[PDB]
Amino acid sequence: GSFVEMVDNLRGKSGQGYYVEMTVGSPPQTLNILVDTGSSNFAVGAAPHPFLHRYYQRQLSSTYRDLRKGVYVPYTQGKWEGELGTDLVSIPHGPNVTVRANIAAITESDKFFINGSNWEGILGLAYAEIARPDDSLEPFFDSLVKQTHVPNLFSLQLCGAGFPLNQSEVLASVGGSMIIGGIDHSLYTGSLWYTPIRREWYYEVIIVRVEINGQDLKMDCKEYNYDKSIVDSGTTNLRLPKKVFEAAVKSIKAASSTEKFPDGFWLGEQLVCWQAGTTPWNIFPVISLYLMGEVTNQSFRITILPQQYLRPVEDSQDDCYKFAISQSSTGTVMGAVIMEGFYVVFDRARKRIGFAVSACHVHDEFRTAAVEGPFVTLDMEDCGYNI
Ligand SMILES: CN1C(=N)N[C@@]2(c3cc(-c4cccc(C#N)c4)cs3)CN(c3ncc(F)cn3)C[C@H]2C1=O
């Protein structure tokens, strides 16, 4: 329906992540928290750090409970270590509830906190299977659903501005909405189409066909989900398995061949700039991902524009961008490139993910992002990877 208290409760941008305000402890300590559908721990800075101006002070919370257990979370780009405990947590622009949740109090970190970023912790919204140290550490959303009458569903509208936001603008701008326990109809246009959650660990999905400007990439569909395909608000790019990335970039280069770009642009390293207002959107192709439908032998497609996969960056008055499609050795990641085009419904209760055209997606007068269906697609379970 309508969840006016939760609409426009996010801030941020794809390169720095999107965050929501939360409170921890008694009296409440306000912190900004990165919204991550790609992990399952609620973890906050709990010790001074040069890039933090606030942190969780456990000794000032009367409701703090020590779990007497450490947690070490190393990952590819960095790591954090901390001490497990529980406390009362609320979301000021959220459901009007307070819950007792697990909190990893971060005491040591490496390349986790970012200078200039305005967030102090991370909210892992995925399932217990991938929580650290193990699946016995109940994730925040699981606690929220168990302790209250909040429906087992949340939805995200991540809003890319379509232009770079400076240090002050990114603080004052609306980055989107996280609707906890519902679907807000003002955030999308057209119909919502649902794809099954394949398995409850990451938000895993199955891609059954890929097109670049309507041209079938024509790969064995297992390649698109090798070794998994996930929906991740904590990844900036659309990341594709090595072989898929190679085929996609060849096709995108062919479609945009009226303009030659350096190898560094396609590697996501180098920016490309055009005179103000002259970005040649029309030379770049649309990209469609077909996802398994809820009905046997049925699929639907989501289509994004170069306004989604060319990330605006500051150089001058030129309009500059980085190519935000990159290679993966851990499967497809539908990051903020995908998510900024759509309103995404994480329907945990019905084990499905919904997509609709976002009311805040960036487009031009000639093309728009799309969510369309149905299409007849056979042997879609064969597209899923095993082992
Ligand atoms: C892609 N991705 C995440 N989705 N989450 C993680 C992080 C994302 C960010 C981050 C920072 C800035 C911008 C963006 C965006 N968009 C994301 C910092 S840490 C957490 N994680 C993880 N893994 C295993 C585990 F038991 C617990 N946490 C893996 C990290 C990661 O590389």
Side-chain angles (χ1 to χ4, degrees), residues 1-76 78 80-145 147-166 168-217 219-380 382-387:
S2 206
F3 298 83
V4 172
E5 49 297 324
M6 290 181 282
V7 165
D8 298 355
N9 65 350
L10 305 181
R11 284 193 287 161
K13 60 186 179 178
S14 62
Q16 301 218 271
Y18 288 88
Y19 61 86
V20 70
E21 187 177 89
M22 298 182 76
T23 71
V24 296
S26 306
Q29 297 178 39
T30 299
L31 299 171
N32 283 326
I33 306 297
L34 181 84
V35 171
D36 187 14
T37 67
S39 69
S40 302
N41 281 78
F42 177 41
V44 301
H49 188 278
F51 306 160
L52 296 177
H53 70 267
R54 63 192 180 173
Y55 59 92
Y56 175 38
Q57 297 192 82
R58 286 167 292 170
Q59 80 287 3
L60 306 182
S61 174
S62 62
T63 46
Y64 167 69
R65 292 174 177 177
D66 189 359
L67 285 173
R68 290 186 38 252
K69 195 187 180 176
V71 56
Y72 171 48
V73 184
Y75 54 87
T76 300
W80 61 251
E81 272 158 296
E83 298 170 356
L84 290 169
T86 74
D87 215 330
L88 299 188
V89 187
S90 301
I91 302 165
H93 306 280
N96 297 298
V97 295
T98 294
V99 294
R100 153 93 47 202
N102 291 311
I103 307 179
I106 295 164
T107 55
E108 282 170 19
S109 60
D110 180 12
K111 300 184 293 297
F112 176 73
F113 300 115
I114 304 162
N115 190 202
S117 133
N118 200 39
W119 53 258
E120 293 92 39
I122 189 160
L123 179 65
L125 289 171
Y127 301 92
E129 178 169 320
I130 61 166
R132 297 286 303 148
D134 54 69
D135 68 13
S136 73
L137 196 77
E138 185 174 83
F140 174 82
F141 206 86
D142 288 59
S143 300
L144 173 71
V145 168
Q147 294 170 41
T148 74
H149 314 272
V150 168
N152 188 24
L153 178 149
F154 65 89
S155 56
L156 292 170
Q157 183 207 48
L158 306 185
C159 298
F163 44 90
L165 298 163
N166 68 33
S168 50
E169 295 170 319
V170 74
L171 297 169
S173 182
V174 165
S177 309
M178 173 167 67
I179 315 298
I180 299 281
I183 298 169
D184 188 297
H185 296 263
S186 75
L187 304 178
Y188 71 97
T189 61
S191 291
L192 274 159
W193 280 83
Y194 291 92
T195 191
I197 290 165
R198 192 201 185 191
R199 201 163 70 76
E200 300 150 305
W201 60 312
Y202 289 96
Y203 287 101
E204 187 185 6
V205 297
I206 291 172
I207 295 164
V208 303
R209 176 181 166 100
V210 175
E211 296 173 1
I212 306 301
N213 259 3
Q215 183 172 191
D216 185 4
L217 211 54
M219 294 183 73
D220 181 318
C221 64
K222 278 201 183 297
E223 296 288 4
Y224 305 141
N225 309 295
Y226 170 63
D227 59 347
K228 61 184 169 298
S229 290
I230 72 172
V231 183
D232 187 5
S233 62
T235 288
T236 297
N237 286 2
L238 166 58
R239 307 183 66 225
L240 300 167
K242 184 178 189 289
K243 197 181 283 188
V244 182
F245 176 76
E246 281 164 359
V249 172
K250 177 191 279 301
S251 184
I252 297 163
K253 280 173 172 174
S256 62
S257 71
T258 57
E259 245 168 88
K260 167 89 193 176
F261 301 97
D263 299 341
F265 170 71
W266 302 106
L267 285 172
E269 307 161 344
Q270 204 179 331
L271 44 80
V272 60
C273 296
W274 286 276
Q275 180 189 115
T278 73
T279 307
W281 300 112
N282 77 93
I283 76 171
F284 288 89
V286 302
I287 299 172
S288 299
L289 300 186
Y290 289 65
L291 302 171
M292 176 181 299
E294 284 217 282
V295 173
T296 308
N297 299 323
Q298 201 157 281
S299 64
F300 63 96
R301 69 192 182 197
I302 62 176
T303 305
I304 62 169
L305 309 179
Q307 283 93 334
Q308 279 74 58
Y309 64 81
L310 295 188
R311 184 169 64 84
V313 302
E314 253 305 329
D315 202 351
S316 79
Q317 280 169 10
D318 284 4
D319 289 338
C320 306
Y321 307 86
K322 274 187 191 178
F323 182 60
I325 303 178
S326 60
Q327 202 184 297
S328 179
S329 65
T330 62
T332 293
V333 186
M334 298 168 55
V337 164
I338 288 293
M339 295 187 72
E340 283 175 358
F342 309 101
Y343 180 46
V344 185
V345 179
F346 297 80
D347 188 352
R348 297 158 55 106
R350 297 174 66 170
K351 204 177 174 179
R352 64 189 188 159
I353 295 159
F355 291 83
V357 173
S358 177
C360 73
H361 85 277
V362 178
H363 61 89
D364 59 41
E365 70 170 299
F366 302 110
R367 303 196 289 206
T368 179
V371 180
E372 297 170 315
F375 302 96
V376 173
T377 315
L378 307 167
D379 303 295
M380 290 187 290
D382 280 337
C383 304
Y385 179 76
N386 306 297
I387 312 123

